[PDB]
Design a protein around this ligand. Sequence first.
Ligand SMILES: O=C1c2c(O)c(=O)ccn2N([C@@H]2c3ccccc3SCc3c2ccc(F)c3F)[C@@H]2COCCN12
Ligand SMILES: [Mn+2]
Ligand SMILES: [Mn+2]
Length: 178
Amino acid sequence: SAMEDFVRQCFNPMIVELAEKAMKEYGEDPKIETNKFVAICTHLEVCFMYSDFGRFEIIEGRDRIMAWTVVNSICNTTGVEKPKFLPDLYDYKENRFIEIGVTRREVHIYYLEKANKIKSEKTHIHIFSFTGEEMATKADYTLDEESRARIKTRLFTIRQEMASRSLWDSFRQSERGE
Ligand SMILES: O=C1c2c(O)c(=O)ccn2N([C@@H]2c3ccccc3SCc3c2ccc(F)c3F)[C@@H]2COCCN12
Ligand SMILES: [Mn+2]
Ligand SMILES: [Mn+2]
């Protein structure tokens, strides 16, 4: 599959290895769900960039046990309420958990979907598209504009490499089902 080749060529081996472990956890095959594979790599990379953007602890890219160990440690030392689902980051400055979303759809739709899912006002949502759009809880985008710019540039680049390989249309229609 050209998509698996693109994923392994454009993404860091550490990212790819972590995405493959996540996919194994949920019983998904990166050789069949290749578009998801690349989606998981992309969002992992966004989360890592966001975190180095500070300030942030990363919850994503860890296995469930260690990830919940970190979340509980945070809730014990800061007293922030325990989230109902694994978030992606913890903000020590604003002392709040953060869910990152990356969409090939309109950011407002994905934001509404995420907010309906977590149903907890406490966790902050930050949605990124592949064309520079973003939607965040209370339009509190957390990061400075240079940092968000670097994230947005990397996402657009991925979209354009996919486009270069005639992979973008398939990728786009894979996010939502019928
Ligand atoms: O952590 C996440 C997750 C997010 O944090 C997210 O933002 C979007 C989507 N997620 N989901 C991720 C995921 C992460 C990034 C991009 C796409 C996917 S798509 C479903 C799936 C995920 C992981 C492995 C796998 F095999 C999957 F099928 C699942 C939902 O619940 C549990 C963990 N998780
Ligand atoms: Mn996550
Ligand atoms: Mn996320």
